[PDB]
Amino acid sequence: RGYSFSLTTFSPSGKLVQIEYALAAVAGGAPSVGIKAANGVVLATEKKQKSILYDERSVHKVEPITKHIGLVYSGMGPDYRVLVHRARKLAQQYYLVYQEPIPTAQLVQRVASVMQEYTQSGGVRPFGVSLLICGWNEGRPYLFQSDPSGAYFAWKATAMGKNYVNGKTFLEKRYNEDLELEDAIHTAILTLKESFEGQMTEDNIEVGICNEAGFRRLTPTEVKDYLAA
Amino acid sequence: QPEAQAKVDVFREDLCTKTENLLGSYFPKKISELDAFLKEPALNEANLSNLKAPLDIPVPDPCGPVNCNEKIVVLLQRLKPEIKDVIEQLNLVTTWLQLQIPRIEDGNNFGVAVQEKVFELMTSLHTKLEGFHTQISKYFSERGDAVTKAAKQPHVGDYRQLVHELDEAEYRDIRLMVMEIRNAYAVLYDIILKNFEKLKKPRGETKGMIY
Amino acid sequence: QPEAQAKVDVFREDLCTKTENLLGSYFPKKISELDAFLKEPALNEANLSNLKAPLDIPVPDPCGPVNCNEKIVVLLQRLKPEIKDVIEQLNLVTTWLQLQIPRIEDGNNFGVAVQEKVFELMTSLHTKLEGFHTQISKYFSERGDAVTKAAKQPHVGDYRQLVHELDEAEYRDIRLMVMEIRNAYAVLYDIILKNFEKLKKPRGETKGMIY
Amino acid sequence: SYDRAITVFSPDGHLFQVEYAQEAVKKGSTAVGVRGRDIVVLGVEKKSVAKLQDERTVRKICALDDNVCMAFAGLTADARIVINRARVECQSHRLTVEDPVTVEYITRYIASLKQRYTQSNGRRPFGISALIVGFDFDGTPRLYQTDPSGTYHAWKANAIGRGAKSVREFLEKNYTDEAIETDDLTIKLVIKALLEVVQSGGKNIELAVMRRDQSLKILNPEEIEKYVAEIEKEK
Amino acid sequence: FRNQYDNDVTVWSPQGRIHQIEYAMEAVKQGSATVGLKSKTHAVLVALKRAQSELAAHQKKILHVDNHIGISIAGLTADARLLCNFMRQECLDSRFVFDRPLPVSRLVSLIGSKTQIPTQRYGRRPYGVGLLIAGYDDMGPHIFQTCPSANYFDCRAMSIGARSQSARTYLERHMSEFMECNLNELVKHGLRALRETLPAEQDLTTKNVSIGIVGKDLEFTIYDDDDVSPFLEGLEERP
Amino acid sequence: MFLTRSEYDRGVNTFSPEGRLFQVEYAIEAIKLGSTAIGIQTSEGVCLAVEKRITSPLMEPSSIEKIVEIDAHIGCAMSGLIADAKTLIDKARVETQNHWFTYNETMTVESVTQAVSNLALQFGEEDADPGAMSRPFGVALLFGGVDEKGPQLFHMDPSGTFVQCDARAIGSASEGAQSSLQEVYHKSMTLKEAIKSSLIILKQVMEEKLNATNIELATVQPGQNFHMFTKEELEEVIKDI
Amino acid sequence: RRYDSRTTIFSPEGRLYQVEYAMEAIGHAGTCLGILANDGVLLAAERRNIHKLLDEVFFSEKIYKLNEDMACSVAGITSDANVLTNELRLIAQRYLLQYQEPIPCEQLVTALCDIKQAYTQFGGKRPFGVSLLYIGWDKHYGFQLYQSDPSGNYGGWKATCIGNNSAAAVSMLKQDYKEGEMTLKSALALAIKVLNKTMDVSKLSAEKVEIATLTRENGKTVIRVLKQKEVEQLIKKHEEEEAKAEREK
Amino acid sequence: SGEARKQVEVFRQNLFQEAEEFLYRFLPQKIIYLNQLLQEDSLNVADLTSLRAPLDIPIPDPPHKCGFLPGNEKVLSLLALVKPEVWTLKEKCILVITWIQHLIPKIEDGNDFGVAIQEKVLERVNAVKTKVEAFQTTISKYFSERGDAVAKASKETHVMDYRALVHERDEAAYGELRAMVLDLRAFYAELYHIISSNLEKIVNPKGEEKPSMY
Amino acid sequence: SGEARKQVEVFRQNLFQEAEEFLYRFLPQKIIYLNQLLQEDSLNVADLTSLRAPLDIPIPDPPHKCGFLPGNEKVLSLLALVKPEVWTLKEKCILVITWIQHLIPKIEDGNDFGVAIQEKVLERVNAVKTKVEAFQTTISKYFSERGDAVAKASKETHVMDYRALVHERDEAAYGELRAMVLDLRAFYAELYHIISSNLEKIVNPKGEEKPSMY
């Protein structure tokens, strides 16, 4: 009824419906999986393209906010770019003020605060993208998810996007805390494999790894090797 | 004046307890009982030609008493108690919900709404069951008219066919009423059970108090 | 006009006092009497066959006075005063709320709305009771039609069955009516009692005196 | 139809949302003020201890400044904003004119704040009515009341809040020059009146007196017990 | 239904008509009639004022913007007072900046621009006053009318207000005579034209008629209750 | 046959088919909710009278203030919402004072009404300023004062229109009081006759019996400044009725 | 019809429904409990989140340290909470800069509550949907526990629970809490007992609860989140104590 | 034509004076008279057995047209008292509906609230009209129904349900008459209350013309 | 009480399996079976005159009860084929209606889109039910109408319209049986199409549990 349309209106039952509707957008998004291994965090997502015509090198689902922090998204694509840019900017502001790379937890709190701001005003629409943010700070791997609501949770492993619920179950069954990243990247490709609905190919999937060295996107050749397994 | 408040209170408590018993036990037991009746062979007969009962009316170039179709009558005797029972229980559920409806207020209406939507569905079942009762009553009158017409006019073959047809139709209607009653009992349970928290306490817990 | 005012005031006072008496004392008392009546054995009979009454129609290979089902008649005689009593009470309560409805105004309609919602429920009951009153009459006419039909056409067995079926149905309907009559008295008590403050004073007595 | 916006005027020229805010005041706890010749007494009912709740935090009666005290009935939070804003003004007047605020100046200021909220949509009228008691420079006792609308009136005695109608009737009959003759008698009148509307006894009334130059004093629960006893004994 | 498309000035109707602007135009009809006519040397405004009650004074229908320009209002008085102030300030501004009486035509263009902005933007209602503006500038006597819609027209003569068709009719038939008319004749012709608007029982009186005259040698002057007596006395009786 | 749809009434800034701007009209209706106030202008002076409408004996009569002094020369009797009146009386008080400061003279009653009227007209969202009430003001003020032109009474309405009135009644019983005023008013009446006549009309319109407490009466004769009859003076005049 | 949208419209009957609707949200949230004891004040919360793949990187999910001398637990929309906690931390630091003394506990609560009232009064913003318990020691009133509501109305409570099954907890606390006799050790036990009843899980996981205690030691307040081993001992002690009473029965 | 307006104006004025008089005289008097008819024991009979009226039809037993079977006299005398009242109310209700219909104002875009008060009052007057008209139909239905039962009962002497129907039909009319006299009394009362409470808006729906804003 | 939920859940699990089975197998199979009947020559008779059945009623002329008049055999054989078919569709629809009603979720303020997909489907199933129930009624009416017309013809041998009516009634029934089978075929098809396309929301209206905002 009336509660559904407004974003500043709590429904009888105290649910802000437009945010719930916004989360539904993320669910419709392409599957994305994040596993936090002891030595690293692997972020991977499906980049399935409608046609061979699309040039894959042009746009990347997995992006680097800073040398040690990288993010993947499930949801509305235009929105991801806005958040990524604000994130890249928020980090540079930390560097200028404190001259130290931003701790990952700090960026996720800051990006989330931006998301909450969009939620408050009637004029704007909540962002429809959820971000998985992975980083290596203080010799420790970190993985975090920020939902359109503005809430950040820390996940040892999680999957967002289509078939998220099934993905999480597969991961809970296959997750070992002591896993090394080389094993973990394999676990992730398997998790995506569950819902791919097509032959996975190097182009169809995009994967990124965070370690002491810092966030990097595995190039297509490297993934082909991992897929060969 | 609460001098007789005890009478009002007893009725209120009794309805609540009776309802719990119907919701907790009678409805589950009846669904099993009815499923057994559907399993029972009388309800399921493949060829209605078997159901057909002979008419003694003479065929033209003084009719003896022409009996009814016993098979149909026996099925009716099993079904008639059940129809009346569901109507009584439906009244009980309606009464219980109405006692649960709270003091009318401007807001926090969701809950009063849930109650109304549930009340509407129960009332819809009441109508269908009242209709089922009417269909049972009409069968005797129509069949009786059909046999008299057949007897008065032996020349008309169709009137004879109508008696057989009305019988065939009644068997099918009875089986459907039984199927519907089983369905009606279950839906009544599904609606009340799924929405029980709101039906029982529509307004919800008392809040902090802004004033 | 002042002499006229006295006549109007007398009615206004009389309606208000009577309603409080009905709600305060008569309604609780009636709920108790009716629930007792439902428990009374005549109202609950396990075998409807006992209800069946003799048909003297001579079965064909001269009809003596056929008689009414006394058991149904005695129950009806108990039920009929109650059905009439409830309708009268509904009128008193409907009139009372109507006199309570305040001068029409463009706001603070809540309260006038509560009065309207209750009226809808009271009106619904009045409609349902009228249906009960009508049903009682139809039973006598319908059964009478069936017996004449049975007498006219002894050959048709179904007509005799109809007379028995009608009596059983009436017994079942009467049982529901008693339950519903008790429920109506109860629901009326709950709705009027719960929202009494708005019904008695729809607008409210506040005088901020902003103007 | 004409009740959804403060700005809209109903056919018949009634602004409904302002009237509805006045209804909110009625839901609030009762408060009574009596202007005695030398003492002004403000008394408010306390809803309940709740057992596990500290009572120091809940205070209906507050001092706007040394010479002005206010009691409120209505949404509690709004009162805290109005009380705070009045306190800033009392001090600001002292800064601007070097003189202590008269009781009426504070009443007019509080009223204007409320009217400002009623005037434009996009703000909700403060749902509070307040009794402001004070002694003026001449030393005349003054009692004023304000309503969500922004109307201020001076009342010799008044009750705001739930049951106000009943207490005000009691006060109309009970109030007399004779009753206000003794400072104790004045405290007794308010206690007696609140007793009429309070479901419990003295346990549920918080009462305070402001004397000609003395600061507001919230009477100790024991002092209240003594007064209720004298009243009960006399009954 | 078509209840929709009429709520705001920002909604175009399916057939190209902005209804609120039209509804605003209806406001001028509600007001008392006013007639404006011009001669080669003078421009005249005559108005039929209305009174709330016998005790109450008749309202002001003719207002002086400047020595060379004056207006007569038909419609909501409030909108008129606001527009008049804008016009007066625009005229005062020209004298301070350029030391020239503002050309009357230029002022009407400015009133049009201010008036149009409410029509296209959500928010302020379209002004619902209809204004007849009369002035003598170097180009000559000028009579202009402004609709609640910002459109403005230059007229040999015009009547705006209730029952103003009747006046326009008289003016059209006797129009040629006006150009060479003397001032007394021109006001007399106008008083007759507004008389047509009046109900048959009602008659022009010193109390309900206001005459404003501006000319090469005459600064805009509003002859009022006792000063309309010279112009009114010469008039005849109802046709 | 009833067509009661309305649907153009809600929301100022909306012109009804027929161009009626109903919200403003409804505001004019509000003044009828207010207590009746009657003003008579006579050569001797202008007299203003109002009915207090005191709800409870405990409320102090002095506080109800339906007649107030804008300045010594001009006074105002207000009927309608009390609160919006307070703003309009304030604009008037500041404008009279601003005129003394800028021009060292006393504003005429008409200019002061024009000044308050200008504020009332702003309700239309005419200006971009945030601090302007969106709703039309709900008060009608009768402003009476002795100026250069002698005793004058101007009546202002929520629309913001102002007119001189020899006698006007604003308020609940204005219709009917006005009718009576029309019969009684003669230009030659002295203030003494007017005070008696106005109070006679008020006694008829007011529900309660007239008593010094229930009425407020003021006069601004040319030599004197705004004067409010005290209870003693009021008692003498009411006794004469 | 609908007088429950926009947060600025009083309903006939004077109720602001949007605030009431907001209060409903706190009910869905995980239970948080605070008990005041003569020695110290404790906050214990139920970490509703129990998904196996979640990491306890933070000091606490629901307990936040507003200032050296005070702490808060939040129940309600998490995003709204993050905004309020940031604000509370700034409000406190501003008092210290201005008066160079720690913010008195009530004042921090009163100020946040004022931000919460404003959101209710002005038209565009939704009322904040969080209810939070503040625990702190102030020189003026010693150890204090305060509970806040979306309304902006705050209260001082010796013990209170906000969130799911709050009513059951308050009832249990009402009989169990002994005024003037509570010690942190006893209170931690009362907390485990009430939490056990309120939480649906038969056994408190000891990973399903977070308990934080504020005590003044050596003249400086210490807010410590009890580590899991410490809580596990408390759960075992309760399990044994209740079992012993059952064994006696 | 002014003369045509005058002729309607004469009718309108007469209706207003009658309505005012009916409101201050006939309506209060009727409430009292009807309450008395209800108070009278005739409509307050404790046992319906006394109302049972002789049905002289010979029953069939083993070894001509029935003699005149008259209508239940008790019911008829009550019907004779009620029938004038049903018509007085219908006519007086009609007078009121015309008064309101005449008072309805020229259709306008807004300030149509007074019209609404008139519409809601009319809706009540219409509802009362349908109920009262039905009462008149019931009287005829009773005579036809009782008559048909008497005919059937004589035609088939054996069936005794038909005999019960005659007794029941008579019983119902006694019950109905009691309710009907109650309703007419209540209806005069409700009409007086709605009209008196809302008289100002009904008499002058749009009110005094708004002071010129134009 | 848990025991009660278990039995009802069993009924639900049975309903789900039966409903799924019906959609997967019975509905497609029936569409083929009913289309076969339409193609069958019996339902595609070129000349309706062939369907005419003899009415041996003596035709009157200027100088006994008619011999038994049998019902058109062709129509009865066809009706016998149609009457079982009508019943199965009504039963299979009732199974679907119950399944959807069982699946309707707990009433909640938000996420009511799924409830709507179900409600829209319920509307189609309700509409189909009324149409099919009507078909069952028509079968009964044909026998009664043909019979009454035959009776009238015998009583009044002279009127020949009565004779034509009987022949006409039979031709009408034949046309309607063809339409009814065509409708049953279509109804089976429509239910498969609406349920198949909208199955995910119909089975799972609310959807999976969302991430916690609390």
Residue showing tokens 């559907």: B38
CA–CA dist I125, I115 (Å, integer): 15
Q: Which CATH superfamily is domain F22-240 in?
A: Aminohydrolase, N-terminal nucleophile (Ntn) domain (3.60.20.10)
DSSP states of H60-93: P----PPPP-PPPHHHHHHHHHHHHHHHHHHHHH
CA I112 vs CA E96, I122, I203, I205, I212: distances in Å: 68, 15, 14, 8, 19
- Collapsed DSSP state (helix, strand, coil) of residue G136: strand
Nearest residue to H144 (alpha-carbon basis) of H116, H164, H118, H173: H173
Residues 6+ apart with CB under 8 A from C70: C53
Q: Which of D16, D23, D53 sits opposite G156 (nearest CB)?
A: D53
Angle at E92 between CA E87 and CA E97, to 5 degrees: 125
- Among B186, B201, B195, which Cα is nearest to B29's? B186
Structure tokens given for B17 = 């307890």
Given C117, C155, C162, which is nearest B65 (Cβ)?
Answer: C155
C-alpha–C-alpha distance, residues H196 and H185, integer Å: 17
- Cβ neighbors of F125 (< 8 A, separation 6 or more) are E123, E124, F12, F13, F132, F134
Domain that holds residue I92: 1-214
Breaks (C-N over 2.5 A) in chain G follow: none
Sheet of strand D128-135, all strands in order from the earlier edge strand to the far edge: D61-63, D68-74, D128-135, D141-146, D152-154
Q: Is E50 on the interface with F (CB under 8 A)?
A: no
CB atoms within 10 A of CB D4: 16
- Tell me if H110 and F1 make a contact (CB, 8 A cut-off): no
Q: What's the token pair of residue G183?
A: 């010690």
Torsion over CA: D169, D174, D175, D176 (sign): positive
> SS3 letters for chain F?
CCCCCCCCCCCCCCCCCCCCCHHHHHHHHHHHHCCCEEEEECCCCEEEEEECCCCCCCECHHHCCCEEECCCCEEEEEEECHHHHHHHHHHHHHHHHHHHHHHCCCCCHHHHHHHHHHHHHHHHCCCCCCCCCCCCCCEEEEEEEEECCEEEEEEECCCCCEEEECEEEECCCHHHHHHHHHHHCCCCCCHHHHHHHHHHHHHHHCCCCCCCCCEEEEEECCCCCCEECCHHHHHHHHHHC
Tell me the residue range of the domain where A208 lies.
2-228
Angle of helix D183-197 relative to helix D164-174, nearest 10 degrees, comes to 140
What's the sign of the alpha-carbon dihedral C104, C106, C111, C113? positive
Give me the helix-helix angle, C157-194 and B112-152, nearest 10°. 160
Distance CA F51, CA F176 (A): 15
Kindly list the partner chains of chain A, i.e. chains with 3 or more CB atom pairs below 8 Å. B, G, I
Instruction: Give chain I's count of helices (H) and strands (E).
Output: 7, 0
Resolution value, angstrom units: 2.9
Task: For residue D14, give both structure tokens.
Answer: 């009634």
- What is the spatial distance between Cα I168 and Cα I153, in angstroms, rounded to a whole number? 13
Q: Is I25 exposed, middle or buried (0-12, 13-18, 19+ CB in 10 A)?
A: exposed
Cα–chain-centroid distance for residue B156? 37
Identify whether the C-beta of residue E37 lies closer than 8 Å to the C-beta of residue E23.
no
Is residue H1 classed as helix, strand or coil in its secondary structure?
coil
Give the Cα separation of A122 and A6 in Å (integer).
Answer: 7
Nearest CA in chain G to A177: G53
Burial C159-169 (b: 16+ CB within 10 A, else e): bbbbbbbbbbb
Pairing, β D152-154 against β A216-217: unpaired
Residues of B in contact with C195 (CB under 8 A): 103-104
Q: How far is D194 from chain G (nearest CA, A)?
A: 23
Would you report the helix, strand and coil content of chain C in percent, each value rounded to 5? 75, 0, 25
User: What would you report as the CA-atom Rg of chain C, rounded to the nearest whole angstrom?
Assistant: 24
Structure tokens at H13: 């004025």
For residues E44 and E214, what is the distance between their CA atoms, to the nearest angstrom? 7
What tokens does A5 get? 């349309």
The chains found to touch B (3+ Cβ pairs under 8 angstroms) are A, C, D, G, I
User: Minimal Cα–Cα distance from C175 to chain G, Å?
Assistant: 40
Distance between CA atoms of G65 and A73, rounded to whole angstroms? 32
Secondary structure class of G214 (helix, strand, coil): strand
- In this structure, what token pair is assigned to residue F27? 């505001």
Residues 6+ apart with CB under 8 A from I184: I34, I85, I86, I89, I132, I135
Q: Is D12 on the interface with H (CB under 8 A)?
A: yes
The token duo for C118 is: 């209750």
Q: Which domains does chain D have, with CATH numbers?
A: 16-234 (3.60.20.10)
Give CA separation, H201 vs A19, C104, F176, H20, H197, in Å: 49, 9, 17, 15, 9
Interface test with G, best of D1, D19, D54, D88 (most G CBs within 10 A): D54
User: d(Cα G72, Cα G223) in Å, to the nearest integer?
Assistant: 11
Q: Evaluate whether A90 touches A62 at the Cβ level (below 8 Å).
A: no
CA C143 to chain H, closest CA, distance in angstroms equals 7
User: Quick check: G25 contacting I, CB < 8 Å?
Assistant: yes
User: Residue C2 contacts by C-beta under 8 Å, 6 or more apart in sequence?
Assistant: none
* Residue G29 main-chain phi, psi, to 5 deg: -75, 165
Please name the residues in contact with H155: beta carbons below 8 A apart, sequence gap of 6 or more: none
* Spatial distance between the Cα atoms of I32 and F67, rounded to a whole number of angstroms: 93
Partners of E44 in the β-ladder = E37, E213
Query: How many C-beta atoms surround the C-beta of residue I141 within 10 A?
Result: 12
Provide the b/e sequence for A92-130 (b: ≥16 CB within 10 Å): eebeeeeeebbbbbbbbbbbbbbbbebbbeeeebbbbbb
Q: Which of B110, B112, B198 to mutate to test the interface with A (most CBs of A within 10 A)?
A: B110
User: Considering all CA atoms of chain A, what is the largest pairwise distance in Å, rounded to the nearest integer?
Assistant: 54
| CA dihedral over H175, H181, H186, H191, signed as positive or negative | positive
Question: Which amino acid, residue I69?
Answer: L
- Rg over alpha carbons for chain B, rounded to the nearest Å, is 24
Query: Domain limits of chain B?
Result: 1-211
Of G11, G120, G160, the CB nearest to D52: G160
CATH code for the domain of G46: 3.60.20.10
Side-chain-facing half-sphere of D59: CA atoms under 13 Å:
14
Q: Which residues sit opposite E73 in a β-bridge?
A: E131
For chains I and H, having 3+ Cβ pairs within 8 Å is answered no
Distance CA G135, CA G215 (A): 10
Torsion angle of C-alpha atoms I21, I24, I25, I30, degrees rounded to 10: 120
Residues on chain I touching G29 (C-beta within 8 angstroms)? 214
Rg (CA), chain A: 18
Strand partners, G76: G130
**Comparing C-alpha atoms, which of F15, F28, F1 is closest to residue F175?**
F28
Quick one: CA torsion of B138, B140, B143, B144, rounded to 10 degrees?
-120
Q: Say whether the I–C interface has 3 or more Cβ pairs within 8 Å.
A: no
The reply to whether F178 touches chain H by the CB within 8 Å rule is: no
Per the entry, the structure determination technique was: cryo-EM
Cα distance between residue C174 and residue C133, in whole Å: 11
* Angstrom distance (rounded) from CA F173 to CA F198: 13
The ranges assigned to domains in chain F are: 22-240
Beta carbons within 10 angstroms of residue G96's beta carbon: 13
Q: How many separate domains does chain H show?
A: 1
DSSP state, residue A57: G
Q: Which tokens hold the place of D200?
A: 């419990």
The order of strands in the sheet holding A157-160 is A157-160, A32-36, A41-46, A205-210, A216-217
Given the structure tokens 């099954």, which residue do they identify? Answer: G165
Specify the DSSP element, H or E, that contains D88.
Answer: helix D76-97
- Phi then psi for D130, rounded to 5 degrees? -135, 150
Q: What is the DSSP letter of C137?
A: H
**What DSSP line would sit under chain B, residue for residue?**
--TTHHHHHHHHHHHHHHHHHIIIIIHHHHHHHHHHHHHSTTT--S-HHHH-----PPPP--PPPBP--HHHHHHHHHHHHHHHHHHHHHHHHHHHHHHH-----SS--TTHHHHHHHHHHHHHHHHHHHHHHHHHHHHHHHHHHHHHHHHH-TTBHHHHHHHHHHHHHHHHHHHHHHHHHHHHHHHHHHHHHHTHHHHHSSS-S------
CA distances from E122 to E10, E20, E21, H44 (A): 6, 11, 12, 70
Angle at I39 between CA I37 and CA I45, to 5 degrees: 95
Half-sphere exposure of F5 (CA within 13 A, CB side): 10
CA dist., res. A56 & res. D100, Å (int) = 77
Cβ contacts of F53 on chain C, cutoff 8 Å: 209
Whether residue C211 and residue F55 make contact (CB cut-off 8 A), yes or no, is: no
- The closest alpha carbon to D121, from G13, F23, A10, belongs to F23
Give B152→chain C minimum CA distance, Å: 10
Smallest CA–CA distance from F13 into chain E, residue = E125
Cβ under 8 Å to G: D residues 50-69: 50-54, 56-58
Residue G2 forms part of a structural domain: no
